[PDB]
Amino acid sequence: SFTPANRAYPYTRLRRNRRDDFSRRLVRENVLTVDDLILPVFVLDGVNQRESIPSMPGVERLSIDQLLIEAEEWVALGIPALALFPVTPVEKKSLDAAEAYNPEGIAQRATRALRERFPELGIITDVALDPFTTHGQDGILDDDGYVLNDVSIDVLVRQALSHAEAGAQVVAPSDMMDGRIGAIREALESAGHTNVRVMAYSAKYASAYYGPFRDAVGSNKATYQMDPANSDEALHEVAADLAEGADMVMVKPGMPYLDIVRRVKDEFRAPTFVYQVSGEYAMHMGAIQNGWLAESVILESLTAFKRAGADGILTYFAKQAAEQLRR
Amino acid sequence: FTPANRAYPYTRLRRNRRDDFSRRLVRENVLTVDDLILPVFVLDGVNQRESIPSMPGVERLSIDQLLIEAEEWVALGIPALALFPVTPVEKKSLDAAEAYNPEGIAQRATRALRERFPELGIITDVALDPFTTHGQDGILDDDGYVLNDVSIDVLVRQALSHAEAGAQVVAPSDMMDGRIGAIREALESAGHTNVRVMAYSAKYASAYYGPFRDAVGSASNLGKGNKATYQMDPANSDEALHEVAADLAEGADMVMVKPGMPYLDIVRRVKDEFRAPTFVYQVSGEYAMHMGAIQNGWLAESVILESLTAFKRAGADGILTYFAKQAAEQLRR
Amino acid sequence: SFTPANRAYPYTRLRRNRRDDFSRRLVRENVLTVDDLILPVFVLDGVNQRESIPSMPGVERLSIDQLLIEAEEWVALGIPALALFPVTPVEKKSLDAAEAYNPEGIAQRATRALRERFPELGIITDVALDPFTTHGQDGILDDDGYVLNDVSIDVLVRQALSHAEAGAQVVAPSDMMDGRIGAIREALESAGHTNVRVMAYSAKYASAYYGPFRDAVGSNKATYQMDPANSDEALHEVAADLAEGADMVMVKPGMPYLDIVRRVKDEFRAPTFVYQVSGEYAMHMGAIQNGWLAESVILESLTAFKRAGADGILTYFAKQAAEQLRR
Amino acid sequence: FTPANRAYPYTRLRRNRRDDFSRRLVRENVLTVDDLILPVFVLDGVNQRESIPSMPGVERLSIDQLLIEAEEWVALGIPALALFPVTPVEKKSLDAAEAYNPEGIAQRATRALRERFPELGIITDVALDPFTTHGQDGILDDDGYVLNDVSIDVLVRQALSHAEAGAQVVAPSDMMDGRIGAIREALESAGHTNVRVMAYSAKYASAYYGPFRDAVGSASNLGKGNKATYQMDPANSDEALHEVAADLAEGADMVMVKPGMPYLDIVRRVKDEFRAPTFVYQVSGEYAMHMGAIQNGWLAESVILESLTAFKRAGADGILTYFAKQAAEQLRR
Amino acid sequence: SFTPANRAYPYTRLRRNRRDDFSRRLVRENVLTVDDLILPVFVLDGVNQRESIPSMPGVERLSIDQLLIEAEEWVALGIPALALFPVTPVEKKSLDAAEAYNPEGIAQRATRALRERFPELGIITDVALDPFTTHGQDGILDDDGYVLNDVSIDVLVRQALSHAEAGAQVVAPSDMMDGRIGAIREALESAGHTNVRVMAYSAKYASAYYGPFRDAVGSNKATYQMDPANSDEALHEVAADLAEGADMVMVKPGMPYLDIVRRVKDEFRAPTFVYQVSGEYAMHMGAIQNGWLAESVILESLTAFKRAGADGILTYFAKQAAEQLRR
Amino acid sequence: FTPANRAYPYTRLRRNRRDDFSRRLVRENVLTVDDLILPVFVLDGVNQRESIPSMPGVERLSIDQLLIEAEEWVALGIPALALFPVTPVEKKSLDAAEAYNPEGIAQRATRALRERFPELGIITDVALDPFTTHGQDGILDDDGYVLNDVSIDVLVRQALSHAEAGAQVVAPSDMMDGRIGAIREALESAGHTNVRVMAYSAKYASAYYGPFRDAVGSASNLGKGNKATYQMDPANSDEALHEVAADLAEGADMVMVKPGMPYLDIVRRVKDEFRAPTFVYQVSGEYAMHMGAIQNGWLAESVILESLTAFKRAGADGILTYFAKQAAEQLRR
Ligand SMILES: [Mg+2]
Ligand SMILES: [Mg+2]
Ligand SMILES: [Mg+2]
Ligand SMILES: [Mg+2]
Ligand SMILES: [Mg+2]
Ligand SMILES: [Mg+2]
C-alpha cells in the first residue's frame, strides 16, 4: 500500500535528507552484506590446475585442491555458501546423463571435500543434466529432439539423492522441468534427507545472457525456459515450487529481471534468490577493464538486488564484493 | 494474486511453451518502434562527426550531420529524439547562461529538426551540467552546494527557450526539488499550453553515467565530483514513489526512472502505483556494457532486444536507448 | 492499485500527450498484433466446395482441400492458430453423438491434413457434442430433455482423445459441463498426451449473439451456459478450470463481456482468451457493408479486447485484421 | 478474490442454473427503467419528422412532435432525455455563437419540455460541434487545432444558457481539459446551485459515432476530420482513471464512459476505483449494428436487453441508449 | 477500493443528485425485486386448518391443503421460493429424531404436494433435528446434555436424502454442526441427487431474535451457534461451507448482522442469503400495528439487505413486500 | 482474507464454542459504558415529566428533572448526553431564530448541565427542524425547497450559541452540503478551538424516525412531508463514503451513520475505509420496535445488549441509544 499524504514542495523538499551523509545513512532503505552472497565456482576434474575463461575475465576453473585453497579465504571473508558447477570431461558425457548421479562425479567429490574441510560453509549443488549430456540440452531427448519432462526428472532425482549422500546442505534444480521440485522433495523425504534444502530455479528465462557460462562449463530451450516477455507466468512457476516443497525460490537471470524479483517477493513473502548470471558478470567486468565504468558499479548492481527484494544473490563478483564490504 | 490451486501434473507450464504458435499467443509483452526514443549528442559547427571510445558505435554529430542521419531514424519510425548538446569548453560558466541562449546548440538543433521533420518528437534536456564549469546540474553556493531554488530560476529560462525553439517536450533531468511545478507554471503563463514535461522523477546517483559524461564533455568539469545531495541513493525504493507523486502533482505529462535495467523494480512499482505514462532511460553505461560484450563475442546481438523487452515487461511505456536505431532495424525485419 | 497523485488542471492537461502522433504513440497503452489472432473456420465434408452463410456475410464454409489452400495465406500473414468447426452431415448426427470421436470425422481429418501441411500452425479443435446430436443440444439428454453432465463428459473425453490422436496441439472444450476440464486433462495425461493444451471455454454465457454460428454449422441452454447478469460467478468458473488443469481460459461472447475479461485477467493472471462471436461479427460486417460504419471499427473492436486484458482473440475478422496490420 | 477451495463434484455450478427460480435468486444484476436515458434529435420548425437511414427506427423530431412522443416516454417511466439539436446549416459559424443563443433549438426544446413534463429529466449537450462550420467540438486556431481554454469560454456561455432554460443536467461532451471545473464555477457563481453536471469523462476517439454525425448533421462539416487531439486513444485504459479523477475533483455529479459496449472494461474500472455515479453511452454505431442485424433476422430482439444488461453488470448506474423506448416497453411487460 | 478524488464543497454538492426524483432514480444503487424474496411457511399436520401465532402477528400455521391454496397467489406474485418449517405433533418427537427422515413426515408430504402442483416454485426444506427432538435442541444429546456433532450429522444426512427423494430442489441445513455441508453433499452426490442445491446456514448466531419462531414451530445453543460478538469467525464458517460444496451461503439473523452480510459477499463473491428472522418480523409488525412506524419500514428493511450484499432474503414479509412491489 | 486451508475435521469451529472460558477468550468485541451516549428530550418550564406513547419508557423532562435524572446517568458512567429540545409551538417560525436564542431550551440545559456535572459530555443538536413551522431541517425557498447555504448561515449561528453555552460537542444533524466546514470555520474564528463537531455524515431519509418526531413535537409540523432532497436514499452505500470523506476534510472530529441497525453495513464500510471515530444512532424507531416486542413478551430483554453489541462488531466507536441507562445498568451488574 501507498499514500502520498499530500506532500508538496516547498514544505516537502526531498533533498533535505540527501543533504548530509549522516541523514542519507539514517534513511537508507537497503544495505548489502556478506550474508547476501553466494559464490558460483567452476570445478575441474584434475589436480593442481586452473584455467582461464575467455568470456569471463578474472574467473577461473579450479581443480578440487585449488578450490579448497581458495575456499579458506572465501570462508575468512564470511561468504555463506558456494554454488558448484562441475566441468565434465568429454569421455563421461552420454545420452543418459548417468554421470549426473555418479558418486565419484566431480560435484560429488567436491562436495565431500568441502563438507569435511569447512563444515560451516554452505554447499549448493546443481541439479541439472546439461553438464552430462552429449547434446548439452537440459534433459533426455526423445526421437524428435524434445526434452522429455518426466523421464528427465527420474534422472534429476537420482542426481539430487547423490548430492544429499555426498553431504550437500542445498540442492538447486536448475533444469526447468515441470513438477521436478515435488519429485525431488518426495525422494529426499523418503530417503531420510529431512533437512536438505531445495533451492528451486523457479522463474528461469530463456536468455542470451548465459553465453559465457556455456563456455565456462564446456557445454530448443524455449520449450522449457521462460519467455523473457512474461511476468505473470513467473508467479505461477513460484507458486507451484513452493507448494511442491522448495525452501528457497530463485529468479534467473538477475538484473534484467529485477521486476520479477520484486513481484515474487511481494506476492509470496518467501526466501527469494537471484542469479547475476555469467553475461551480467562479463558485461560489467569488460566495461570496468576497458576503463568505461568504475569498480563502484559492482556494489551498485548488487545493492539493486537487495532493493528489488532478493534475500541472496548468486554472483561471480562475490569475493570482490565481500572484500569491499570488509573494508 | 490467486494461484487457483494449480498443481502438477494437471498443470504443466511447459505445454504453452511447446510450440512457437502457443508461445506467441500467450506472450505477455511486445517491444515495438512506438516504444523507442533515441538520444543524440550534438556538436557545434559543420560537417563534424566524432566517435566516443566508451560508447562504441555512437557518434557526436553537428546539426547538418544530425539532419542527414535523422532521415533514416524517421524512415524507421522512431517517434522521438532526445537532444544532448556537447557544449564548447569556452561557453561553460558559473551562471550557466548558455543554457538559455536562443543560439545555443540545443536551441539551434531543435529549430532545424522541427522545420525538417515536423512529425518527429524533439525532447530537449533541461539541466545545467552541460553549461557549468564544475559539471554540477545547478548553481553552486559558496560552500560548494547545488542551490535548489536559484537553479530552478535558470532551468525555467532554459525550458522557456526550448519551448520558443519549438520543442514538443522538455525533460528536466536536474533533480532539483519542485522544478517540475516551476517549469509548468512558467510554460502555462507564457502560453506554451501543450509543451510536454517529461520529468526525470526517480533519477539515481549512479556510476552507470560515466560514458555519457565523456560523450557530452562534462567529465573533465565534474572530475571526481558527485551528485549525492540531489540524485537518489541507489538503495532507496519507497523514496521513488514520493518523487513521482510530487512530479505528477506538479504537472508532469510523463515520469521517468533513470538508470534503467539496474532499476527495473522501480519501473514496476511506479507503473503499478501511479498508472501514468512511465519512461525509463537505458543509460550510457548500460549501452557500453552490452556493446563491449557483443563486440568481444561474449554475448549475441539478440541481447539488445532482450534488454529492451525487459523494460516493457517491467512497465515502461517508452525507453530512451542508444540502441534505438539497431532495435528499430531489427523490429522492421 | 491507483492514486490520483493530486493531478489538477491546468498543471495537468491530459491533451498535451494527445497533441501529436509521436506522443500518442509513446504513451499508447496497448497494441494489437497478429500474435493475438485465432481464426475460426467452418469445415465441410466434401471436396472442391465452398458455401456462403446468409447471416455471416463474407464467411465461407470450406471443404478440406479449400481449407488447405486458404491456410497457405493465413500462414503467410502470420496468424498463429485456427479454431476448427466441422459442419456435420445429417446422416451422421445421433442421440449418442458418436461421430464426435470418429477418427474419420471432419474435425479429425482436417486436423491431420493441416498438421501435415503446415506443421507450425496451431490447430484448436472444438470439444463439444452439439455438432453431433440430433437435438443440437450440447450433450446427452435424459428422458426429460435435460443435458446430463457426467454422461456427456464421458463422450467429450473420447472426443478430446481422438483430437489429440489426430495431432491437435490444443483442444477447446466449449460445452459448459461442470468438471469437464479435469476429466479431459486426466484422460490426456493417462494416455500420454503430455503437451496437448486445453483451452477452457470457462465463462461462456447463454447468449442471443450465437445466432449466425448456429446457421454456419447447421445446428434449455440456461441450465449450463451462464446468465448474462452474472459477473462474480465467472470468477468461480475460471478458478475451477485452472485448478482442473486448463492451460488457457476463455470468456464467451466477447465485446458484450469485456468487463469479465478484465476481471478474469486481473484476478488470475493466467493466459486469457476471448471469442468475438458470430453475432458480433455479423453486426459489424452488416453495418460496414451498409455504409453505416467505417472499416476502422474492426481494429477498434479488436484493440478493445487487448485493452480489456485478452491474450488472444478468436475472431472471424482474423484475416482482414492481419492484412491491415501487415500494411 | 478467494476461491475458497471449491472443487468439482462437491461444487457443481450447474445446480443454481437448474431451475428458473434458482437462476432468479442468484441473478447478480437486473436492468430497470430507472437505468434508461433516451437521446433525441431535435429539429427546427413545426410538424417535422425525418428518418435517419443509418439509424433505423430513429427519427429527428420538431419540438411539437417531441412533446407528443414524450407523453409515451413519460408513461413508460423513462427518467430522462438527452437532447441533441439538429442545427440548421446557416446557423453554423467559426465562433459557434448559436451554442448560447437563448432561442437556439436546445434552449427552446428545454423550456417546452420543462413546462410540459415537470418531472422528466432534461440533459442538455454542452459541445460546439453542432454549431461549428468545421464540425470540431471547439474553436480552431490558425493551425487548425481545437483551442482548449478559448473553447471552454464558449462552453461556459452555452451551459449557462441551458441552466437559464431550466435544464436539470448539463452534459459537457467536448473533451476539453478542465471544462468541468470552469462550468461548475460558472454555475455556482450564477446561482445554479443544483444544476447537475454529467461529465463525458472518458470519451474515446471512436469510429462508432458515424451514424450520430449523420443524425445531427455534423457529418458534412467534419468531412474526413478527426478528434485525436482531444478524444481518447481507444488503446488507453489507465488514462481513463486520470480523466475521471479530474472531473470528480472539478465537481461533476456523474461521470460517463463513451462509447459503451466496446469499453465495458473501462466502465468496470471506473466504478471500481471511484464508487461514483457512473454512466455509459450506447452510441449510434452500437445501435445501428444491433438494429441492422435484428432487421436482417440475424439476431433475435432479445439481444437488446442482453446488451443493456451488460452495462449494469459492468458497473453502470445509467445508460444513454437509442433503444430506451423499446427496452422500457419490454421491461413493462 | 475507494478514492475520494479530491471532491470538495461547493464544487461537489451531494444534494444535486437528490434534487429531483428522476436523478435519485438514475443514481439509485440498489433495488429490491420479487426475485429476491423467499417466504418461510409453518406447516401443520392436519387438513382444512390454520392457527394464529401470538408472537408473530399476521402469520399463520397452515395445513397442507391451505398451503396449496395460498401458494397459488404466492406464485401469481412471482415469489421464487418457499422455505418449509413443519410443526411436528408431540407424539412424533423422540430422542433419536427419526421423524426427521420419515418419508411421510410433514416436510416430505408438503414438498411432494407443492412440487406436483407448482412445478416451477422453489421448495427449500429445513435440515435440522430440533423440530423432532423431545428436548428441542438441534441434535442428539450425549449423557451430559451436549449436542454431539458427528452423530447428529448422520441423522441430518438421512433427513436431507429424504427431502431430495421428496423432490426438494434445495435443502437448507440450519443446524450449525461442524462439517455437515460436506457430509450432506457427499451423500447427495453418491445417491445421484446431482442437482439438489445446498443452502448452508453458514454464519448462524446464538440470538434472542428467534423467540417468536420457537413459538411458531412449538419447540446450550452457545456451544454451536455463533457468539454475536464475532465477525472474523463468520468468514471461516463460510469458507468451510463453500469448500464443502454449498451452492448458497446464509447469514442468520439478518438486520442485526448486515455487516456480516457485507463482509461475506465482499470476501467470497458467492450467492449470499440472509434470514430476516421471526423476532425481526415481530418487532416491525408490532410497531406498525401499534401505529408507531409506517408500513414503509418493511421495504426499507428489505432494501437494507440488498444494499448490504444479499442475493436473497428469507422474510415473513415476502407476500406483503411482493404485493407492494407489484403495484 | 486467507482461509489458510482450514478443513473439517482438523478444524472444528465448535471447539472454541465448547466452554464459556474459551468463548470469552476468543470473543472479538465487547460493549462497555465507554460506548454509550444517551439522547434526552428537554421540556421548557419546571417540574415537567411527559411520557411518549411511541417510545415506551422514555420521558420528556424539564431542566430541573433532567438534572436529577443525570445524577444516576453520571453514577452509571455514561460519558455523554445528546440534547433534543421540545420547542414550544409558539417559538417555531420561518426563520428558525429560536435555534440561536441564548435563552433557548438547548442553551439553558447546556449551561445547567455543564455547571452541575463538569465531566459529563454534552452534545447539542445543530438542526433547524425543532424550530421551523414546516418541520424541515432548513429554511424554505418560495418553491418549498430547503435552501442549502442560507440554512448553513442559521446553523452556524446555532452552533456558536451552543459553544457559548459550554457544549463540548456540537452535532449537525441537518444534512446540508458543506455545513461541517462552515461550522468549523466559524468555531475556529470565534476561538472555540476545542469544541468537537460530531457530523451526522451518512444520515438516511428513513421511516424509522417516526417516534422521535412525536417526542420532539416536529411531527405535527412536518405532516406528510419528506426529506429526500437532503437525507440519503436508503438504497445507497457508495454515496455514504463520499459524504464521510467530505466531512472529514471539512474538519469533523467524529462521523456518524444514522439510522443504526438497518445500516450496519454502512458503519462497517465507513470504519474500514476511513479509520476515524465512527458513531451510530440507534434511532427512536429501533428503540420502539425493541421495546414493543419486549413488553409484549415476544423478545427477552437480552436483545438490548445483543442489538448494542452489533454496533461494536460492525465498527462503531460509540452509540447514541435510548437504551443507554438500561444497558449501563446491565453492564454494571
Ligand atoms: Mg516450474
Ligand atoms: Mg523530485
Ligand atoms: Mg465450468
Ligand atoms: Mg477531461
Ligand atoms: Mg460451520
Ligand atoms: Mg454531507
Side-chain angles (χ1 to χ4, degrees), chain F residues 97-123:
Chain F
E98 183 68 8
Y100 53 81
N101 188 347
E103 296 302 316
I105 292 165
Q107 291 83 1
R108 283 168 17 235
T110 297
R111 287 190 299 266
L113 286 156
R114 296 293 293 114
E115 177 181 59
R116 178 66 183 84
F117 305 107
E119 290 298 305
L120 175 66
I122 303 305
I123 302 168

Short mmCIF file of all heavy atoms in Angstrom, two decimals, chain F residues 97-123:
data_model
loop_
_atom_site.label_atom_id
_atom_site.label_comp_id
_atom_site.label_asym_id
_atom_site.label_seq_id
_atom_site.Cartn_x
_atom_site.Cartn_y
_atom_site.Cartn_z
N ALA F 97 -35.29 31.37 14.16
CA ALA F 97 -34.42 32.19 15.02
C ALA F 97 -34.22 31.62 16.41
O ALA F 97 -33.19 31.87 17.05
CB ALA F 97 -34.96 33.60 15.12
N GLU F 98 -35.20 30.85 16.90
CA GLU F 98 -35.09 30.27 18.23
C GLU F 98 -33.87 29.34 18.32
O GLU F 98 -33.34 29.11 19.41
CB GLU F 98 -36.38 29.54 18.61
CG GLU F 98 -36.40 28.95 20.03
CD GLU F 98 -36.41 29.99 21.15
OE1 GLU F 98 -36.54 31.20 20.87
OE2 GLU F 98 -36.31 29.58 22.33
N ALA F 99 -33.40 28.85 17.17
CA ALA F 99 -32.24 27.95 17.12
C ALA F 99 -31.02 28.56 17.79
O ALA F 99 -30.23 27.85 18.43
CB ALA F 99 -31.90 27.59 15.69
N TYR F 100 -30.85 29.88 17.65
CA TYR F 100 -29.67 30.55 18.20
C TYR F 100 -29.98 31.48 19.38
O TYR F 100 -29.16 32.30 19.78
CB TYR F 100 -28.87 31.29 17.12
CG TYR F 100 -29.68 32.23 16.28
CD1 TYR F 100 -30.00 33.51 16.73
CD2 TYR F 100 -30.14 31.84 15.02
CE1 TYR F 100 -30.76 34.38 15.94
CE2 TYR F 100 -30.90 32.70 14.23
CZ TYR F 100 -31.21 33.96 14.69
OH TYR F 100 -31.96 34.79 13.88
N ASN F 101 -31.17 31.32 19.96
CA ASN F 101 -31.55 32.10 21.14
C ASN F 101 -30.68 31.67 22.33
O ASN F 101 -30.70 30.50 22.71
CB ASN F 101 -33.03 31.86 21.44
CG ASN F 101 -33.58 32.78 22.54
OD1 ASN F 101 -32.83 33.44 23.26
ND2 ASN F 101 -34.90 32.79 22.68
N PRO F 102 -29.91 32.61 22.93
CA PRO F 102 -29.12 32.19 24.09
C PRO F 102 -29.96 31.72 25.27
O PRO F 102 -29.42 31.08 26.18
CB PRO F 102 -28.34 33.46 24.48
CG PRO F 102 -28.99 34.57 23.76
CD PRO F 102 -29.71 34.03 22.57
N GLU F 103 -31.25 32.02 25.23
CA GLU F 103 -32.19 31.55 26.25
C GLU F 103 -33.10 30.42 25.76
O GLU F 103 -34.11 30.11 26.39
CB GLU F 103 -33.03 32.73 26.78
CG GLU F 103 -32.21 33.79 27.52
CD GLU F 103 -31.43 33.23 28.71
OE1 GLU F 103 -31.99 32.44 29.48
OE2 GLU F 103 -30.25 33.61 28.86
N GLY F 104 -32.74 29.80 24.64
CA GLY F 104 -33.49 28.64 24.16
C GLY F 104 -33.28 27.45 25.09
O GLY F 104 -32.34 27.43 25.89
N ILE F 105 -34.15 26.45 24.99
CA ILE F 105 -34.07 25.28 25.87
C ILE F 105 -32.69 24.62 25.81
O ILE F 105 -32.08 24.35 26.84
CB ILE F 105 -35.16 24.24 25.53
CG1 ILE F 105 -36.55 24.77 25.88
CG2 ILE F 105 -34.89 22.94 26.26
CD1 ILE F 105 -37.69 23.97 25.26
N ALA F 106 -32.21 24.36 24.60
CA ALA F 106 -30.91 23.69 24.43
C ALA F 106 -29.78 24.44 25.14
O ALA F 106 -28.94 23.83 25.83
CB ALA F 106 -30.59 23.53 22.95
N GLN F 107 -29.77 25.75 24.97
CA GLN F 107 -28.74 26.59 25.56
C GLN F 107 -28.83 26.59 27.08
O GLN F 107 -27.81 26.44 27.76
CB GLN F 107 -28.83 28.01 25.00
CG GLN F 107 -28.42 28.14 23.52
CD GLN F 107 -29.53 27.78 22.52
OE1 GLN F 107 -30.65 27.45 22.90
NE2 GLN F 107 -29.21 27.87 21.23
N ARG F 108 -30.04 26.77 27.60
CA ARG F 108 -30.27 26.77 29.05
C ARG F 108 -29.87 25.43 29.67
O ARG F 108 -29.19 25.38 30.70
CB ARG F 108 -31.74 27.10 29.37
CG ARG F 108 -32.04 28.59 29.23
CD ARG F 108 -33.52 29.00 29.23
NE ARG F 108 -34.47 28.02 29.74
CZ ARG F 108 -35.54 27.60 29.05
NH1 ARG F 108 -35.77 28.04 27.82
NH2 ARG F 108 -36.36 26.72 29.59
N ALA F 109 -30.27 24.34 29.02
CA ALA F 109 -30.00 22.99 29.51
C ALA F 109 -28.49 22.73 29.52
O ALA F 109 -27.97 22.15 30.48
CB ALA F 109 -30.73 21.95 28.66
N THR F 110 -27.82 23.17 28.46
CA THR F 110 -26.37 23.03 28.37
C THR F 110 -25.67 23.75 29.53
O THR F 110 -24.82 23.17 30.21
CB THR F 110 -25.86 23.52 27.00
OG1 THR F 110 -26.42 22.69 25.98
CG2 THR F 110 -24.33 23.46 26.90
N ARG F 111 -26.03 25.01 29.76
CA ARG F 111 -25.39 25.75 30.84
C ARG F 111 -25.62 25.09 32.20
O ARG F 111 -24.71 25.03 33.02
CB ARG F 111 -25.84 27.21 30.86
CG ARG F 111 -25.27 28.04 29.72
CD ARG F 111 -25.56 29.51 29.91
NE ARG F 111 -26.99 29.80 29.95
CZ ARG F 111 -27.72 30.16 28.89
NH1 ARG F 111 -27.16 30.27 27.69
NH2 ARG F 111 -29.02 30.39 29.03
N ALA F 112 -26.83 24.58 32.42
CA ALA F 112 -27.17 23.95 33.70
C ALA F 112 -26.37 22.66 33.91
O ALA F 112 -25.82 22.43 34.99
CB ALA F 112 -28.66 23.69 33.79
N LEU F 113 -26.29 21.83 32.87
CA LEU F 113 -25.59 20.55 32.98
C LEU F 113 -24.08 20.74 33.07
O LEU F 113 -23.41 20.03 33.82
CB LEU F 113 -25.94 19.65 31.78
CG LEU F 113 -27.34 19.04 31.80
CD1 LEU F 113 -27.78 18.69 30.38
CD2 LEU F 113 -27.36 17.82 32.70
N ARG F 114 -23.53 21.69 32.31
CA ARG F 114 -22.08 21.95 32.36
C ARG F 114 -21.64 22.40 33.75
O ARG F 114 -20.55 22.07 34.20
CB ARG F 114 -21.65 22.96 31.29
CG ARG F 114 -21.84 22.49 29.84
CD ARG F 114 -20.92 21.33 29.45
NE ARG F 114 -19.51 21.71 29.43
CZ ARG F 114 -18.59 21.26 30.27
NH1 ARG F 114 -18.90 20.39 31.22
NH2 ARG F 114 -17.34 21.68 30.14
N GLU F 115 -22.50 23.17 34.42
CA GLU F 115 -22.22 23.65 35.78
C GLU F 115 -22.32 22.52 36.80
O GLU F 115 -21.44 22.38 37.66
CB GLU F 115 -23.19 24.77 36.15
CG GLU F 115 -23.02 25.29 37.58
CD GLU F 115 -24.02 26.38 37.92
OE1 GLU F 115 -25.25 26.12 37.83
OE2 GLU F 115 -23.59 27.50 38.26
N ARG F 116 -23.37 21.72 36.69
CA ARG F 116 -23.65 20.67 37.68
C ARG F 116 -22.76 19.44 37.56
O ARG F 116 -22.33 18.87 38.57
CB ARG F 116 -25.13 20.28 37.60
CG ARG F 116 -25.57 19.16 38.53
CD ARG F 116 -25.51 19.54 39.99
NE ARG F 116 -25.89 18.40 40.83
CZ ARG F 116 -25.06 17.43 41.21
NH1 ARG F 116 -23.78 17.44 40.85
NH2 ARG F 116 -25.51 16.43 41.96
N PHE F 117 -22.49 19.02 36.32
CA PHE F 117 -21.71 17.82 36.06
C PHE F 117 -20.57 18.14 35.10
O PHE F 117 -20.66 17.83 33.90
CB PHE F 117 -22.60 16.73 35.44
CG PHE F 117 -23.81 16.39 36.26
CD1 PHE F 117 -25.08 16.80 35.85
CD2 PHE F 117 -23.70 15.64 37.43
CE1 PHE F 117 -26.22 16.48 36.61
CE2 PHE F 117 -24.82 15.32 38.20
CZ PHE F 117 -26.07 15.73 37.78
N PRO F 118 -19.49 18.78 35.60
CA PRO F 118 -18.44 19.27 34.71
C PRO F 118 -17.77 18.24 33.81
O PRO F 118 -17.23 18.60 32.76
CB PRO F 118 -17.41 19.89 35.67
CG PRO F 118 -18.20 20.21 36.89
CD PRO F 118 -19.23 19.13 37.01
N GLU F 119 -17.79 16.97 34.21
CA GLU F 119 -17.11 15.90 33.43
C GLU F 119 -18.03 15.22 32.41
O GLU F 119 -17.55 14.43 31.58
CB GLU F 119 -16.50 14.84 34.35
CG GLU F 119 -15.29 15.33 35.13
CD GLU F 119 -14.14 15.74 34.23
OE1 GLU F 119 -13.71 14.92 33.38
OE2 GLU F 119 -13.67 16.88 34.37
N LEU F 120 -19.32 15.52 32.45
CA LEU F 120 -20.29 14.87 31.58
C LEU F 120 -20.27 15.54 30.21
O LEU F 120 -20.36 16.75 30.11
CB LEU F 120 -21.68 14.97 32.20
CG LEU F 120 -22.87 14.44 31.39
CD1 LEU F 120 -22.79 12.94 31.18
CD2 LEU F 120 -24.15 14.82 32.10
N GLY F 121 -20.14 14.74 29.15
CA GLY F 121 -20.16 15.30 27.80
C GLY F 121 -21.56 15.75 27.40
O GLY F 121 -22.53 15.02 27.63
N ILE F 122 -21.66 16.95 26.85
CA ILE F 122 -22.93 17.46 26.35
C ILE F 122 -22.80 17.67 24.84
O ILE F 122 -21.94 18.43 24.39
CB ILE F 122 -23.33 18.79 27.04
CG1 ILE F 122 -23.42 18.63 28.57
CG2 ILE F 122 -24.66 19.32 26.46
CD1 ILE F 122 -24.35 17.53 29.07
N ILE F 123 -23.66 16.98 24.10
CA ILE F 123 -23.66 17.03 22.64
C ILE F 123 -24.96 17.71 22.24
O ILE F 123 -26.05 17.16 22.44
CB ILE F 123 -23.64 15.61 22.03
CG1 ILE F 123 -22.41 14.82 22.51
CG2 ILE F 123 -23.68 15.69 20.50
CD1 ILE F 123 -22.48 13.32 22.18
#
